[PDB]
Design a protein around this nucleic acid. Structure first.
Ligand SMILES: Nc1ncnc2c1ncn2[C@@H]1O[C@H](COP(=O)(O)OP(=O)(O)OP(=O)(O)O)[C@@H](O)[C@H]1O
Ligand SMILES: [Ca+2]
Ligand SMILES: [Ca+2]
Ligand SMILES: [Ca+2]
Ligand SMILES: [Ca+2]
Ligand SMILES: [Ca+2]
Length: 901
DNA sequence: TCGTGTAAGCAGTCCGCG
DNA sequence: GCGGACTGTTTAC
């Protein structure tokens, strides 16, 4: 095999590198890497090294890495640019793995771990680590074993060994229901005392040193607790054995208000799954507890126990230990599904960065562009300081709030990355400027043509056309990767809908699921077999199709996120290629593109409908248009359609064979007008939306910008078995809206769009009648809670105190002098409920940590003083009034003359 | 919430508006 | 009672 790195570190003048050698063995080595940096030099001087603008450079080879750094300082002191990769370990990887890395994940040690720590006096601070570590479960990816380190004796209780036989049994037999598929992979080690546990743990760690280290809040809790606990018992030298190079650094994480500390372990790549999840999942959740995310991702029941976690070990050590092991498995099950670890290795190895740098698109792209330029003996510029400056972004059209019956939407494929490619936007492709006219002149094609030589953006920038810049070139490579995976994602989704259809007529038989690749559209032979399967088989196949789809989604969307990130990075001062001329060239060209194409689509449709000045494009945002298709449908007449799917076929055909050609001609002209390098504005039909044929549903509605709902039948060529609501901005989509409210609002919207006003009124009336019975958590609002100290004035609210913060302050007074009451955590989410007049808590709201039950001390009182009227009015009726007025519709029946009978 | 960007919605506070 | 100015927050792209 080809060799590939695992981890890399600079330590003084040495690179420390852990790698897989040519026989597949893990190795470590210390290299006294002599880095090279660069300086401009005269034209008379012969060299093969040039900067990105074509000016000659001399390479300067240093005796060692500190010399290179001292040189950089001195070049600033002199006031001259010091060129080249100043992150020396990235240059080391480029020199050492000067080819496309083919990695083999089965050789990479991925460690999932979780610890337990019993604490009577509140939350155990990782920086103090004053309490014993009484459980560690550490799963190893190479051994495929869960190693359990169980403390039997501590100051807080002596306990018996955990029993794997009881762990395996059903909850209903008084067992812990530890999944049978992992029971045999458990290797359990009890310990007389903590020192022995820890020492054995460190010995194990040295034998099985993690390359990738993950878990749930391992970076903010587990890793620092273990490091500081060991440090306090045995001293620093011993705690540092968690690093395979014996180097660790207390690293302080800063934000706008406050800071915390983490322990950087040199030669380990820490990928905390909570952060993997926040970056790669594209969800915004009301809670990030493991039980909550587990429930959401896997539909696994919350892990149940009695009494506080501070008493669980002494009351039920059996369950204590089992739940520690299930906690580790849950993360592994989430990864099996989401595949973020797999995604992280792909991007990190593609870029030639430390794997943990996948969290920084700046670092990721700095490494990709560096490696790309180095292949041509080109030398990257020095990073400079820049002051943060605001700059303009996308155009969003003001919609006329209304119902809209038949809608077809279109939007640009990978808009900003395509803009970059089409225009050739790159630091080294800037050719100059031209005198700009107001944007509306370009939009309406009355402005003078910017250039007959260079490719232009309407912000005034001109770019070369003789060659692709490094940014277009590298963004294209990742875009193509993205497109591939999205194809798989969409095929699995289409395959998904075939199985749902078949499930309308499951066969009474015993059989098995077909072994197939869900990333490719099912052949006819597969379609035939499917129609003969049992519901059990079809269902297992569906689950599998959706897993394939999720796998595809992770691969495609985060590649999109990365390429969109590069466009964004051009506007971040820390980016080596920061330049508001290029960031703004992107955004401004997008504004033109959308408004230009709005004009063309309107012109085109007015022509086919024999009209003038009529607006068919009702809305658009950044790179999308929404076309009212009422008149197209009416031109054939609603009577002429067999069923819903028949008019959906007709619009699909119309979009494909009429609209997209018109759109493409419109953009081809724009390309030529802007003299761009290449036509890459591809506006594919997104959604086909409308009411069920012959129903009283309104099909869709807008309330305003970034707020609308569509009843969709076809999405990017996926024909649904059942219609599906696309909803954006509305309260059903926000993590702040109570869970039960999201659900009820969504059903109101479904009835509105599919069934009509009357259906809506029937549901409204019932929801108002019964909502008081809803579980308090299900009807609580949710908010992030920042700056709790700034508004805290003697435990009471200061001036301008946000509502949710008021709730927290109410909570804190209600639980004061209580060591085991859950504390609200600064910067994390809280549930919020309004309180009726004259309640015990002496205020109008109360808030507690989200994803949890409110402590039993005050629960009964909160339930009793809960203000259901205020709650209903703010979270449900207000939004619904918004939806309904916009749609010109009544949620309560108005009086008529028939009332007289 | 350490980690690419801007546009824009909404809830709430404070307070004007004769 | 509703809006503008402002803070805090949370999406849509
Ligand atoms: N997270 C983001 N960061 C930076 N820019 C973004 C982000 N999301 C969207 N944009 C910008 O808005 C444009 C349109 O967004 P959209 O969600 O349609 O993605 P896209 O890049 O066009 O990909 P797709 O082909 O899936 O539509 C992007 O091309 C860019
Ligand atoms: Ca735990
Ligand atoms: Ca798009
Ligand atoms: Ca069948
Ligand atoms: Ca879009
Ligand atoms: Ca598309």
């Amino acid at each position: 095999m080809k060799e590939f790195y695992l981890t890399v570190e600079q330590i003084g003048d040495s690179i420390f590198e852990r790698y897989i050698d040519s026989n597949g063995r893990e190795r470590t080595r210390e290299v006294e890497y002599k880095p090279s940096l660069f300086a401009h030099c005269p034209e008379s001087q012969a060299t093969k090294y040039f900067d990105i603008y074509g000016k000659p450079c001399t390479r300067k080879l240093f005796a060692n890495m500190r010399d290179a750094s001292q040189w950089i300082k001195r070049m600033e002191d002199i006031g001259l640019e010091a060129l080249g990769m100043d992150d020396f370990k990235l240059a080391y990887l480029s020199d050492t793995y000067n080819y496309e890395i083919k990695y083999d994940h089965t050789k990479i040690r991925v460690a999932n771990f979780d610890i337990e720590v019993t604490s009577p006096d509140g939350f155990p601070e990782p920086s103090q680590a004053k309490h014993p570590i009484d459980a560690i479960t550490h799963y190893d990816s190479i051994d495929d074993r869960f190693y359990v380190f169980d403390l039997l004796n501590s100051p807080y209780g002596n306990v018996e060994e955990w029993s794997i036989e009881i762990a395996a049994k059903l909850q209903e037999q008084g067992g812990d229901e530890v999944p049978s598929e992992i029971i045999d992979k458990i290797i359990y080690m009890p310990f007389d005392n903590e020192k022995e546990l820890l020492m054995e743990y460190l010995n194990f760690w040295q034998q099985k040193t993690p390359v990738i280290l993950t878990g749930w809040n391992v970076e903010s809790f587990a890793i620092p607790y273990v490091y500081n606990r060991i440090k306090n018992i045995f001293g620093e030298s011993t705690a540092k054995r968690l690093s395979p190079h014996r180097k660790t650094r207390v690293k302080v994480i800063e934000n706008m208000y406050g800071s915390r500390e983490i322990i950087t372990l040199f030669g380990i790549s820490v990928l905390d799954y909570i952060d993997l999840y926040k970056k790669f999942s594209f969800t915004n959740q009301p809670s990030y507890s493991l039980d909550y995310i587990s429930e959401f991702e896997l539909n696994v029941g919350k892990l149940k126990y009695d009494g506080p976690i501070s008493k669980l070990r002494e009351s039920n050590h059996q369950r204590y230990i089992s739940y520690n092991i299930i906690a580790v498995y849950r993360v592994l099950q989430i990864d099996a599904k989401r595949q973020f670890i797999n995604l992280s290795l792909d991007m990190g190895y593609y870029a030639k960065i430390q794997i943990q740098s996948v969290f920084s698109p700046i670092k990721t792209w700095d490494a990709i562009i560096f490696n790309s330029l180095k292949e041509q003996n080109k030398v990257i510029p020095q990073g400079r300081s820049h002051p943060v400056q605001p700059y303009p972004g996308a155009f969003v059209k003001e919609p006329i709030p209304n119902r809209y019956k038949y809608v077809m939407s279109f939007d640009l494929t990978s808009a900003y990355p395509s803009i970059i490619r089409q225009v050739n936007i790159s630091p080294e492709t800037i050719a100059g400027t031209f005198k700009v006219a107001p944007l509306h002149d370009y939009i309406n094609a009355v402005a003078e043509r910017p250039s007959d030589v260079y490719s232009c953006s309407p912000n005034g920038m001109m770019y070369y056309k003789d060659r692709d810049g490094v940014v277009p070139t590298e963004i294209t490579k990742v875009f193509n990767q993205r497109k591939e995976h999205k194809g798989y994602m969409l095929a699995a989704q289409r395959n998904g809908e075939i199985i749902k259809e078949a499930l309308h007529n499951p066969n009474l038989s015993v059989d098995e699921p077909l072994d197939v690749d869900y990333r490719f559209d099912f052949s006819d032979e597969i379609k035939e077999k499917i129609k003969k399967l049992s519901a059990k088989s079809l269902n297992e196949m569906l689950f599998r199709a959706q897993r394939t789809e999720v796998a595809g989604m992770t691969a495609q969307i985060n590649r999109k996120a990365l390429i969109n990130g590069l466009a964004g990075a051009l506007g971040n001062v820390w980016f080596r290629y920061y330049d508001l001329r290029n960031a703004t060239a992107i955004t401004t060209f997008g504004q033109m593109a959308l408004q230009w194409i709005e004009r063309k689509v309107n012109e085109y449709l007015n022509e086919v409908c024999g009209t003038e000045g009529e607006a068919f494009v009702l809305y658009g945002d950044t790179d999308s248009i929404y076309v009212s298709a009422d008149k197209i449908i009416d031109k054939v007449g609603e009577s002429k359609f067999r069923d819903t799917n028949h008019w959906v076929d007709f619009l699909d055909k119309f979009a494909r064979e009429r609209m997209e050609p018109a759109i493409d001609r419109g953009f081809r002209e724009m390309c030529e007008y802007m003299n761009n390098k290449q036509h890459l504005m591809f506006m594919d039909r997104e959604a086909i939306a409308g009411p069920p044929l012959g129903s009283k549903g309104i099909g869709g509605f807008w309330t305003g910008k970034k707020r609308y709902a569509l009843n969709v039948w076809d999405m990017e060529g996926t024909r649904y078995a059942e219609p599906k609501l696309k909803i954006m901005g509305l309260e059903t989509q926000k993590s702040s809206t109570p869970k039960a409210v999201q659900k009820a609002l969504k059903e109101c919207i479904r009835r509105m769009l599919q069934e009509g006003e009357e259906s809506l009124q029937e549901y409204f009336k019932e929801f108002e009648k019964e909502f008081r019975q809803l579980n308090y958590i299900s009807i609580a609002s949710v908010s992030s809670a920042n700056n709790i100290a700034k508004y805290d004035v003697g435990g009471f609210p200061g001036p301008k105190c946000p509502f949710h913060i008021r709730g927290i302050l109410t909570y804190n007074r209600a639980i004061k002098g209580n060591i085991d009451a859950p504390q609200v955590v600064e910067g994390e989410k809280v549930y919020v409920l309004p309180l009726r007049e004259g309640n015990p808590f002496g205020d109008k709201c109360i808030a507690w940590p989200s994803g949890t039950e409110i402590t039993d001390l005050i629960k009964d009182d909160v339930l009793h003083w809960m203000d259901y009227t205020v709650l209903l009015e703010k979270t449900f009726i207000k939004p619904l009034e918004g939806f309904t007025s916009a749609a010109k519709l009544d949620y309560e029946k108005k009086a008529s003359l028939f009332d007289m009978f």
